[PDB]
Design a protein around this ligand. Structure first.
Ligand SMILES: COc1cccc2c1C(=O)c1c(O)c3c(c(O)c1C2=O)C[C@@](O)(C(C)=O)C[C@@H]3O[C@H]1C[C@H](N)[C@H](O)[C@H](C)O1
Lengths: 104, 104
């Protein structure tokens, strides 16, 4: 489900930045390690995805020394991630009740 | 965030059918109870989603002391749920390794 890799990739990316600001080569690098080599994200997509988020104010960009472009999570970024994790937590619960309410 | 509520609703409906075949009013009830009244789905929304899923072969329908239309998860349905649940566990792990690679 190609809309789902979109989300999965977005989730992982968001988590990398919540760790701390980072640049694309560093981001692809960290992800490939944490996935023990199974996931190589492509620049075009990271550059592609990163445009949407800054467009929506979830992340912002800044140049740091040696000079590479760095990306950081904004507050609306931190907030929207919190709402995401919490809503999805309620979903976990709804589903768990369904399973439990099943056995009864 | 309406792209995420739609995604969440699809998970729940799919997980209801994974519990067992059911009709629309039956589904709304089970969801209302598992969410202690927080997620009250209306008919129209389920018909909308079920039309898409049936078109994509994820679910099918058949007739069941009153006559009800029942919906069922197809064989392809279960398989996508396994691939989905699995791809999503892989993501969880990746994120733990990112956090692990952080401290380490
Ligand atoms: C931090 O959580 C998130 C934060 C932002 C976006 C997301 C998620 C998220 O957790 C998430 C998912 O867990 C799943 C999906 C998803 O899109 C997201 C996000 O977008 C896709 C999925 O909806 C399917 C089958 O289509 C199910 C899958 O849930 C997993 C875990 C569920 N609790 C449940 O067990 C389900 C069966 O598989």
């Amino acid at each position: 489900p190609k809309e789902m890799l979109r989300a999965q990739t977005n989730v992982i990316l968001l988590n990398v930045l919540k760790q701390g600001d980072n640049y694309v080569y560093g981001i692809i690098k960290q992800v490939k390690e944490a996935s023990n080599g199974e996931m190589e994200l492509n620049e075009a997509t990271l550059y592609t995805i990163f445009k949407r988020l800054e467009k929506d104010g979830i992340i912002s960009s800044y140049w740091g020394d040696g000079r590479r472009k760095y990306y950081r999570l904004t507050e609306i970024g931190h907030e929207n991630m919190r709402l995401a994790f919490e809503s999805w937590s309620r979903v976990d619960k709804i589903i768990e009740n369904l399973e439990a309410n099943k056995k009864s």
